[PDB]
């Protein structure tokens, strides 16, 4: 079953899905690697500031990931 319910934040800016591999664009925006990657196939640009963007420029955000994983773990009780 399971769902979300997710505390925003974890949620993707575009699709509002739960993230599984958060990354930060140069923009300072945090996106799910999966989503953003699909955007880069069409146009090599940040989907916000419309500045040039490539995979290389994506830095991972573990702090949040663990935060999500731990959250998913808590959502395994009761």
């Amino acid at each position: 079953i399971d769902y979300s319910d997710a505390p925003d934040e974890f949620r993707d800016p575009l699709m509002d899905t739960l993230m599984t591999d958060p990354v930060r664009l140069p923009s300072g925006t945090i996106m799910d690697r999966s989503i953003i990657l699909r955007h880069l196939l069409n146009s090599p640009t940040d989907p916000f500031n419309r500045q040039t963007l490539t995979e290389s420029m994506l830095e991972p955000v573990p702090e949040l990931k663990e935060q999500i994983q731990a959250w998913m773990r808590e959502k395994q009780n009761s």
Binding site: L14, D16, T17, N42, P47, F48
Partner: protein, 152 residues
């Protein structure tokens, strides 16, 4: 497909966000049952010659939404340099200039702020574009003449 269910999930939020927040003079909903097919309505800005008239649109969402821009156009006839007999609209936002961050709510506004101020240097209907440039009075009059018989 998976990229289908996803695009849909987004479309849904957009619709839920037009309920928690309706744009200025703008209204849009699914044509019932089909989610990738919406109709939109516009109350004709009061800073335009279309003031009063109600103009209907059709929004067809790509299955790759929002990665690909939504196809949208007028059903209602309207006198404007950037809208032609078919219903086509001339907005960069709807062509090569569309960002996945853009939403329907946003687009409608972009369209209204076009009915108030048209871009005649890049016109969909040259004949009209020349009237706008040379003789505004003509334009405004005509725009209303059409808003009169077509949009009411």
């Amino acid at each position: 497909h998976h990229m289908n269910s996803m695009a849909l999930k987004r479309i849904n939020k957009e619709l839920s966000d037009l309920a928690r927040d309706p744009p200025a003079q703008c209204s849009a909903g699914p044509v019932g049952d089909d989610m990738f097919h919406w109709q939109a309505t516009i109350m004709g800005p009061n800073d335009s010659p279309y003031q009063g008239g109600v103009f209907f649109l059709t929004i067809h969402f790509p299955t790759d939404y929002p990665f690909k821009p939504p196809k949208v156009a007028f059903t209602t006839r309207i006198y404007h340099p950037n809208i032609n007999s078919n219903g086509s609209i001339c907005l960069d936002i709807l062509r090569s200039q569309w960002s996945p961050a853009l939403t329907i709510s946003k687009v409608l506004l972009s369209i209204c702020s076009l009915l108030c101020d048209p871009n005649p240097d890049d016109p969909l209907v040259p004949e009209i574009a020349r009237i706008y440039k040379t003789d505004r009075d003509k334009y405004n009059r005509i725009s209303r003449e059409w808003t009169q018989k077509y949009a009411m």
